[PDB]
Symmetry: C2
Subunit: 432 residues, 2 copies
């Protein structure tokens, strides 16, 4: 899949020039037609600031004005309708109207929008044009794109190309080359932050205390998050630290994560004030880092949901999941931890023993004496510490016990064991 993302400012103010790109040439006010002709992408995203809009009767009319002006300009330059348009919240005082709010709303808004567009299945070839962009929208869009692509790179091959034309200068420019400014294979970077404090999801920009306190207390989302926070941090730590059983057992509820992000986004939306008379937009609520973390968390769950299975969870599944999630010494750590349990399983099966509901301590033949659960042992043994894991082997008639034992031996956390694992992993994440 080939994805073209372009950063635009006041696109209607661009002068007619010509562009050079992939040994093609082109005449007009935009790079987008020659980029589409050479790169031939499956999908195009246009990112710009709402600060070009002029219809101040309401928020939906402002977006409608900006969107009509993009669609009119696409027909003019001949670029086709097969496009997504991200209308980011911009800032500044202009003659045609006034736009106020946190500038970082643009990062959170674009991140949210891109998280619903970037495919969560298959390889990605991503092309980014900064040519026409505002400094601030371009930098925040670059950053949001890189953050989600780093997460998609845990499951899939992700390549990224950046473009920028030579500087335009009126009255002297004959033609602009579209330069390559980046060519990267994106490294896998799983989410590596805890969920923050409840002061950090939605922040007052210009809303008084009575309205904010009442609004913050009205949100189901912050109530339900208080309750799941430690479970979600447990899951984040499972990709970061190499804990394949914790990855499956703490796998988040995607419907639930959707409704948290929906409720925060539409509360941010409802707090935007549009004054038709003064031609002022005030974004009275600002997004905080916690909204960004939730968006990334949902995206990471969509990227990895292919690996989630129906319990019970076998050694063979834990190998299979681990091969997709983990690399380097992390992956070898997991294979050493799983291998020790698999070896004992092969020996039991060889002698027609099939233990059920047995603590991992007993299965491995450890001392009943060492039942304290340390951070050190939970983290250094892929989360499979002998005092928190229970083992069950299915009974079968073995023929090749060395190939068969692994799929027939199931592991789960004990109820008590899970809660101690959750505490250790949550705590290790927060002291990163």
């Amino acid at each position: 899949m080939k994805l073209l993302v372009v950063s635009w400012g006041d696109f209607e103010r661009a002068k007619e020039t010509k562009y050079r790109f992939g040994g093609e040439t082109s005449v007009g006010p935009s790079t987008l037609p020659i980029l589409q002709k050479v790169i031939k992408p499956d999908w195009t995203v246009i990112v710009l600031s709402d600060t070009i809009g002029k219809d101040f009767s309401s928020v939906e009319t402002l977006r409608e004005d900006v969107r009509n002006r993009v669609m009119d300009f696409l027909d003019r330059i001949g670029a086709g309708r097969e496009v997504d348009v991200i209308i980011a919240p911009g800032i500044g005082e202009f003659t045609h109207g006034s736009f106020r709010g946190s500038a970082m709303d643009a990062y959170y808004y674009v991140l949210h929008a891109l998280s619903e567009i970037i495919p969560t299945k298959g390889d990605l070839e991503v092309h980014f044009d900064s040519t026409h962009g505002l400094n601030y929208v371009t930098l925040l869009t670059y950053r949001a794109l890189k953050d989600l692509l780093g997460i998609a790179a845990v499951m899939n091959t992700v390549t990224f190309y950046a473009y920028n034309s030579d500087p335009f200068v009126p009255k002297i420019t004959k033609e602009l080359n579209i330069n390559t400014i980046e060519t990267t294979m994106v490294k896998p970077t799983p989410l590596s932050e805890p969920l923050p404090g409840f002061d950090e999801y939605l922040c007052p920009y210009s809303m008084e205390r009575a309205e904010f306190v009442r609004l913050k207390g009205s949100l189901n989302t912050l109530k339900n998050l208080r309750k799941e926070k430690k479970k979600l941090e447990a899951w984040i730590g499972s990709l970061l630290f190499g804990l394949p059983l914790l990855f499956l057992e703490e796998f988040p509820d995607i419907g639930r994560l959707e409704s948290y992000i929906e409720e925060l986004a539409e509360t941010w939306g409802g707090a935007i004030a549009v004054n038709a008379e003064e031609k002022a937009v005030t974004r009275r609520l600002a997004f905080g880092s916690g909204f960004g973390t939730l968006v990334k968390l949902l995206f990471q769950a969509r990227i990895t949901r292919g690996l989630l299975v129906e319990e019970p969870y076998s050694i063979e599944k834990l190998y299979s999941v681990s091969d997709r999630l983990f690399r380097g010494s992390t992956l070898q750590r997991v294979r050493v931890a799983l291998g020790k349990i698999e070896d004992k399983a092969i020996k039991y099966a060889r002698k027609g023993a099939f233990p059920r509901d047995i603590p991992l301590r007993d299965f491995l033949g450890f001392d009943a004496a060492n039942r304290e659960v340390s951070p050190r042992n939970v983290l250094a043994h892929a989360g499979l510490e002998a005092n928190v894991v229970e083992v069950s082997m299915e009974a079968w008639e073995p023929k090749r016990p060395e190939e068969e034992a692994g799929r027939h031996t199931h592991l789960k956390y004990t109820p008590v064991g899970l809660k101690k694992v959750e505490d250790i992993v949550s705590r290790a994440l927060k002291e990163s």
Copy 2:
């Protein structure tokens, strides 16, 4: 250390305006004075494109013209002269001049310059202003700065703030807010790139192939680097995968890395052709990703050189190096590996026995079953594999042997063991 980095284009064409920032107010053509007043940095860096240059016979004439116009503008506005100016290789055709080369040279040049300015001891508070920047020079400078700060964060606390003013509309705007667009605690990111093939240090942009193959063959750098490559990759993998003994034994020669980077940078500099009459700059050689990797590699060595000591290496020294360098399950694996060696050493010291130069396999009491060195066992056990490591206890009179064994027990790779480990770690870095 507080560090201010600024991104400038045609700084002289900016209009007088009012800036708001940190409760202060400033009237001027530049953000720089109000940024310096409010942030009070220890050091300022200005990054701009050489494509502003006017009457050039030579590279030195180009750079003098540009530097002199920056110093005129600094004096004219608030700012002082405790300033580095990075004059970056830019691109495009302008009234006064024509600049041809790889646009990505700006990234490698700014990365090289910042690697010689950003301090490599102590915490970093870094401020980045993009308001006056060219789109392409701004992204490449942001990226370069983030790449180096990620390495610095392995050893020190690094915080990063980015700023961008509201958009300027000519003749209309009056006051401009300087907005915050990023606040970040920079995550530790050790270098995760292998050194590339020998075609990726310097590439012809505009050079005859006879001239290029002759230059290549004349470079001591590429000859020496052919010999050192696997060793340098072993050391990169040691921080990445958690191998504290390999980190000490393969610690690279800083004087030689300096020499390789200066030869590549000097060669790129001399391949730059200036035609006085047609006012044309051609950078005949482009920097490749391998110049980037050598710069990051020298920086990560400077950041970590305070941890290095001479042989021998105690279990106590390896705990402390691991405590500074490693986190999560990587550190807890180091501690378990080292702890098993210490435990066994206490048992020997209790019996008054002080064995020397003994294979780790024999020291731990391993049998004969396997003597092969698997990537799995090297990477999963913090590079302390049983067949490649030799243990020496240096005899003392034990009183509290459980407190004393760590000081007096030393580990070393065997000469044959070091080679296999290098091959395994080098290959792991290249696959992942």
